[PDB]
Amino acid sequence: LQEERRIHAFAMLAERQRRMREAEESGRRQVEQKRLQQEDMIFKEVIKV
Amino acid sequence: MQYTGSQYFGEYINGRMEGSAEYILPTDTRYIGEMKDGMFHGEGTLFFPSGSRFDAIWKKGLVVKGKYTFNDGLQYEDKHWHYCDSYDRRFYTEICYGLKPSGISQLTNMDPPRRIPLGYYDCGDGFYNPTTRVIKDYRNRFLRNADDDEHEWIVRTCRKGWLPM
Amino acid sequence: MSHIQIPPGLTELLQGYTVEVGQQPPDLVDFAVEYFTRLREARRQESDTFIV
Amino acid sequence: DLLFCEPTELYNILNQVSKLSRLAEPNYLCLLDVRSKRQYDESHVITALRVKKRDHQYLIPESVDLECVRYCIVYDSNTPAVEFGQILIHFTRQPVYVLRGGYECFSGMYHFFRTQKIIWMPQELDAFQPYPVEILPGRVYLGKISQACNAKMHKDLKIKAHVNISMETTPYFIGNADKLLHIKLEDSPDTLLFDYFRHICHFIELHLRLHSVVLVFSTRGISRSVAAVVALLMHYNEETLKRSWAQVKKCKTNMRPNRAFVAQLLEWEKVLHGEYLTDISEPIY
Amino acid sequence: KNIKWLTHGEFTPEKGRKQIEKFVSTWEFQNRWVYYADFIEKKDLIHSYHYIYRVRWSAVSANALFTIKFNKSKPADMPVDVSYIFENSELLQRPGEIRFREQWLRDITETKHILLESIPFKVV
Structure with a gap:
């Protein structure tokens, strides 16, 4: 049990590491997507002119 | 078994276990394993309480292995992870x-889309x-609380439930 | 706003297009591609000389 | 016999120290989260077992001599804990204490206590290393020099102030004259810290107005800092010596000045009040 | 290649979506750029409807618009009239034409980048 549980702990730390990576990516993505959207609006206005 | 909760499905010799077997640990972790002398002596996979798989090869009753895979089946590296x-x-x-x-807004970690x-x-x-x-947990109950270091990490790094701009 | 200016050359290409349009071609999409192929030799050289 | 205990006390006791971590003896502590396994997986208190529930009965975790485990604690997330508080009233030689704000503020003020690691083995518990101690609630901390240097401890409280009476150098805020307070002398009784207390108190107070986060140390959490806390409390509340001393006594039970420092504090009291209101003839000083 | 089309009544809007998506799936050559489609309003016309879908790509983005006509005054068995447009282009392309160039998708996205470089920062 001693060995298993310490293994389990380090594994759960790695699980946290992944969860962090995915949460950060989601944060990045929201901003990037919405700025790209308004940049595309600006682009299309320029196109229309 | 009872006194911690461990469980095993396999063969017994002298009353101590020697097996190719599936197995449960009072983590409520599941395992598939081979045994010697009443000890694990196997190449065996440990299936988490969260289903995911760790692997364990046994030398003289100690572990020497590397593999992991998530409960979704994502293959993982504990180092360099690409x-x-x-x-x-x-x-x-x-x-x-x-x-x-189909390009559902699950071009993001969880959706259909909501705030x-x-x-x-x-x-x-x-x-x-x-x-x-x-x-809080996704049943909107609760989770571990955090002061400044973790708070500041969350604040910078991830996605708030700000209003959808 | 990023403004624009009118160089020559384009005007002459449009002029050629309108003149062949003066034929009133059918087959328009390929007829126009073929017209640019005809330009590729003949009308490009002519335009280059025509400017003066 | 069920009682309310502030989370600051939890942070005092669960990282209480006396050479050892008190966590390396079980009769010191028990703490038993009745709630879901899944919360416990996501984390728990720094020796807190996972309760087993069975057909809505609780299966007694006699992990320890429940009869006499001298401090005896329960938390839900907020304040099914209450009935566990009731049942416990039969048990311990001491009364039984509930953790006011079972999780939300206690770790919201101090995240680090959360962890996915369940037990800490006796070597691992004994190997534990204390976070700094809290004097003025949420606002001023007490520490020993190797804590004050410890990078994680310093960073995690988002700290930048030092307050110390000692000769011995420390790694940070060097020459930052407004976010460092440092005084130099031995814990020798002729160190006339009486005057320096006014400066110390005003500096801490200013960080209160600034809401700066402040650590106090006298190398070993020992003595000079203790007297400075007596002065700070007496001037901050216009309290008697005996009140400040009683608070200090729990703040970290090793804390103690010296008899010339006691005389200096007695003059500090007589200056603030105009007279001695506490009598030093008891041994409790 | 192209897909083949229902009749005015055999059509339903969801069938229209699926048909258009499958048409875009018949696009191939740069189709490492992957498509997904968006639903767009019905336009109501005296003896006719139009109904509309947008398509978008991700791998800057490429996008396409498809148009469908519906005959209030002629049979449900009338084969549907369909046409589609690229956001840059005036060209009312029709599924039976010689197929588009995916190269225009490359061209469009490049031009978008070029205007990104162009930007007059008359920004609020």
Whole structure:
């Protein structure tokens, strides 16, 4: 049990590491997507002119 | 068994266990394993309480292995891990499918699309507000609370349930 | 706003197009591609000389 | 016999120290989260077992001599804990204490206590290393020099102030004259810290107005800092010596000045009040 | 290649979506750029409807628009009239034409980048 549980702990730390990576990516993505959207609006206005 | 909760399905000799077997540990972890002298002596896979798989090879009753895979089946590296990172910021499903088969707004970690309900944040397990220092679980109950270091990490790094701008 | 200016050359290409349009071609999409192929030799050289 | 205990006390006791971590003896502590396994997986208190529930009965975790485990604690997320508080009233030689704000503020003020690691083995518990101690609630901390240097401890409280009476150098805020307070002398009784207390108190107070986060140390959490806390409390509340001393006594039970420092504090009291209101003839000083 | 089309009544809007998506799936050559489609309003016309879908790509983005006509005054068995447009282009392309160039998708996205470089920062 001693060995298993310490293994389990380090594994759960790695699980946290992944969860962090995915949460950060989601944060990045929201901003990037919405700025790209308004940049595309600006682009299309320029196109229309 | 009883006194910690361990469980085994296999063969017994002298009353101590010697087996090729599936197995349960009072983590409520599941395992598949071989035994000698009443000890694990096997190449065996450990299936988490969260289903995911760790692997364990046994030398004289100690472990010597590396493999992991998530409960979704994402293959993982504990080192160098090349995933959703400098080579490509795509999640497991987005790398496997590419563009998710119909482009539902699950071109993001969880959807169909909604605001985070309470306020708070997404960090995948739980909702957390920097204005409350509380984490919550996706049943909107509760999770471990956090002062400044973790609060500041959440504040910079992840996605709040701000109003959808 | 990023403004624009009128160089020559384009005008002459449009002029050629309108003149062949003066034929009133059918087959328009390929007829126009073929017209640019005809330009590729003949009308490009002519335009280059025509400017003065 | 069920009682309310502030989370600051939890942070005092669960990282209480006396050479050892008190966590390396079980009769010191028990703490038993009745709630879901899944919360416990996501984390728990720094020796807190996972309760087993069975057909809505609780299966007694006799992990320890429940009869006499001298401090005896329960938390839900907020304040099914209450009935566990009731049942416990039969048990311990001491009364039984509930953790006011079972999780939300206690770790919201101090995240680090959360962890996915369940037990800490006796070597691992004994190997534990204390976070700094809290004097003025949420606002001023007490520490020993190797804590004050410890990078994680310093960073995690988002700290930048030092307050110390000692000769011995420390790694940060060097020459930052407004976010460092440092005084130099031995814990020798002729160190006339009486005057320096006024400066110390005003500096801490200013960080209160600034809401700066402040650590106090006298190398070993020993003595000079203790007297400075007596002065700070007496001037901050216009309290008697005996009140400040009683608070200090729990703040970290090793804390103690010296008899010339006691005389200096007695003059500090007589200056603030105009007279001695506490009598030093008891041994409790 | 192209897909083949229902009749005015055999059509339903969801069938229209699926048909258009499958048409875009018949696009191939740069189709490492993957498509997904968006639903767009019905336009109501005296003896006719139009109904509309957008298509978007991700791999800057490429996008396409498809148009469908519906005959209030002629049979449900009337084969549907369909046409589609690229956001840059005036060209009312029709499924039976010689197929588009995916190269235009490359061209469009490049031009978008070029205007990104162009930007007059008359920004609020």
